[PDB]
Copies of this chain bind each other. A is one copy, B any other.
């Protein structure tokens, strides 16, 4: 009965040169200090965002997985690696290259470290190919971004991808990215605080209200990050709209709240009360422990929030261990 944290990130050892072979303006790459303790994700010549050793160093990662008490970690690509705006073939190469890095990262000790794969989601055919290929090679599932430009999960291209995954029994983690807002949310990390949970909610409602869950096989294992954003809280607002407006009701047959039996969320909500509403809405079976390691905005003491909760001992075990062992079939 170990701790399994199923939402962490990594960034591969890519040089400006190798990145430039893909796109000297848009391919992210990794610059490490000469010491080797600090580092920066770089976009072309520009500095994207400063980072640290646990993101790229698998040996170093463990030592922190030890002091935190985490026994198995699922990790996946930092969202800046997605490449959804690039040209299909170039992106398909990129995903493959990235997914091999993830295996090299993982293979250092593939018992405590599982990976998820990225896919050229702008191109359905290549995206399925990469998903299958990658899982067959070791990955325990896929992580995708919650939208693709003006396409939300209700889009047929994205509904088809989910359907491929269900049929192939490949678990998906859905991550918000490329946040809405435009020029309204520069300061104070507002995009992490306002737009990310809104993106996630939108993803979730898009599946539910479009009807998608009626068409997508119940075998689909799908998980949303950040506790489903602000979903659980505004659900009542949503049922109410379904109950009193035909246009909200058109493509959605059952009341939206019944659909929480079709997906999973992570536990990253940062507040005991918020976590108790979340479990209430989702059930102890559908909530998995996620940290967002090693980003500053993640919980510094992984598992801490759940562990301190006024929750059943069985509930805690599930969220901390049980649910992801099933979901990702880690054993």
Contacts from A to B (Cβ < 8 Å): 147, 150, 152-154, 180-185, 187-190, 192-195, 197-198, 201-202, 205-206, 209-210, 226, 229-230, 232-241, 244-245, 247-248, 250-252, 268-271, 273-274, 277, 280-281, 296-297, 299-300
Complex Cα distance A172/B301, Å?
A: 41
* With A183-B150, A187-B209, A244-B300: A233-B236 Cβ-Cβ less than 8 Å: no
* Chain B hits for A245, CB < 8 A: 189, 296-297
* Chain B hits for A184, CB < 8 A: 147, 150, 152-153, 180, 202
Chain B proximity of A147: nearest CB distance (Å) = 8
Q: Indicate which residue in B147, B187, B251, B268 contacts A210 across the interface (CB closer than 8 Å).
A: B187
* Chain B hits for A206, CB < 8 A: 190
A-B contact pairs, 29 of them (CB 8 A): A147-B184, A150-B182, A180-B181, A184-B202, A185-B202, A187-B209, A188-B210, A188-B252, A189-B245, A190-B202, A190-B206, A192-B237, A193-B234, A194-B205, A194-B234, A195-B198, A198-B198, A230-B230, A232-B233, A233-B274, A236-B269, A236-B270, A237-B269, A237-B270, A237-B297, A239-B271, A241-B297, A244-B296, A244-B297
* With A193-B237, A271-B236, A296-B244: A205-B230 Cβ-Cβ less than 8 Å: no
Closest Cβ neighbor of A233 among chain B residues:
B233
Other 17 A-B pairs with CB < 8 A, given A153-B184, A182-B182, A236-B273: A152-B183, A184-B202, A188-B209, A189-B241, A189-B247, A190-B206, A190-B209, A194-B202, A197-B234, A201-B230, A233-B269, A235-B271, A237-B270, A239-B271, A240-B299, A241-B297, A273-B280
